[PDB]
Ligand binder design. Structure first.
Ligand SMILES: OC[C@H]1O[C@@H](O[C@H]2[C@H](O)[C@@H](O)[C@@H](O)O[C@@H]2CO)[C@H](O)[C@@H](O)[C@H]1O
Length: 281
């Protein structure tokens, strides 16, 4: 869990996520944003056997979840490695969720005050309000997400199935049509994703490996790893790697941005034409 970037959401309301409020040190419980305001790096300390929870805020990069003793308020404060900035991550095996207990006083644990939309420090109990879902942020963002996929080279255009009956995949200006939207679904067993085109019921983005680099939408088929993909952030831009051959990534032909440009797979080569934005419509 060390060094992992996660989202943290509430068992009591799974639509509410820990959110670092811009402009101040506040932490709120907020709807899912799929951005850095709801991402936290888990940092393990060997001496304490406890963790810091550090905001991925790009403007102030060293804020950590902090109990503002002697109050019961929780905010994001500059990291000084203080005891009130360390937490025990206790996984309830009977609920598959976490209790997050203060290292400074482990009798007190995070409590989701869903009415106040913030966190307080509390005693333990059997309520869902002290239980949290900690998930890798890419899985959190993309495990069940209807999206548009755009090349970083042309933000106003999208990867699309050509039409309901033409299963080729190309680039075209965004028009909010069904064939231009995809539902990403994470498969836990395979630890990979499928992209279901919204104009079909069972059509997924597929590498047609029998035809070179071709990508088409095809019916989801039991045993075809070419229909699964890995989504990796670029060291919110992503490469999209095929599971059948992880040297092959989704590729905008020649970095061309004209309407009709081919979407395919290609050898991974670090080009801007292999980097993608994945966004809400
Ligand atoms: O399958 C097409 C590949 O094109 C490569 O870019 C070429 C481009 O097609 C060519 O016209 C010229 O500009 O040289 C480029 C290489 O630097 C992409 O690099 C590749 O990823 C594929 O898209």
């Amino acid at each position: 869990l060390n060094d992992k970037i996660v989202t943290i959401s509430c068992k009591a309301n799974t639509d509410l996520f820990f959110y670092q409020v811009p402009g101040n040190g506040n932490v709120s419980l907020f709807q899912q944003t799929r951005n850095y305001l709801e991402r936290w790096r888990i940092i393990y300390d060997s001496n304490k056997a406890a963790y810091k929870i550090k905001s991925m805020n790009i403007y102030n990069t060293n804020l950590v979840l902090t109990w503002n003793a002697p109050t019961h308020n929780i905010s994001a404060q500059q990291d000084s490695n203080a005891d009130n900035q360390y937490w025990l991550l206790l996984k309830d095996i009977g609920n598959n969720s976490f209790i997050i207990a203060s290292y400074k006083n482990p009798n007190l644990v995070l409590y989701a005050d869903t009415v106040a939309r913030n966190l307080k420090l509390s005693t333990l109990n059997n309520s869902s309000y002290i239980k949290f879902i900690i998930e890798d942020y890419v899985i959190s963002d993309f495990k069940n997400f209807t999206c548009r996929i755009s090349p970083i080279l042309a933000g106003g255009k999208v990867v699309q199935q050509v039409s309901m009956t033409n299963l080729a995949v190309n680039l075209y200006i965004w028009n909010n049509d069904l064939n231009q939207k995809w539902t990403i679904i994470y498969n836990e067993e395979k630890a990979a994703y499928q992209f279901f085109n919204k104009i079909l019921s069972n059509g997924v983005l597929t590498w047609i490996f029998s035809d070179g680099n071709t990508v088409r939408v095809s019916s989801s088929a039991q045993n075809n790893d070419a229909q699964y993909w890995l989504i990796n952030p670029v060291s919110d831009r992503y490469t999209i790697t095929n599971l059948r051959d992880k040297t092959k990534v989704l590729d905008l032909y020649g970095g061309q941005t004209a309407d009709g440009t081919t979407i395919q797979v290609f050898n991974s080569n670090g080009g801007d034409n292999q980097k993608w934005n994945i966004r809400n419509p």
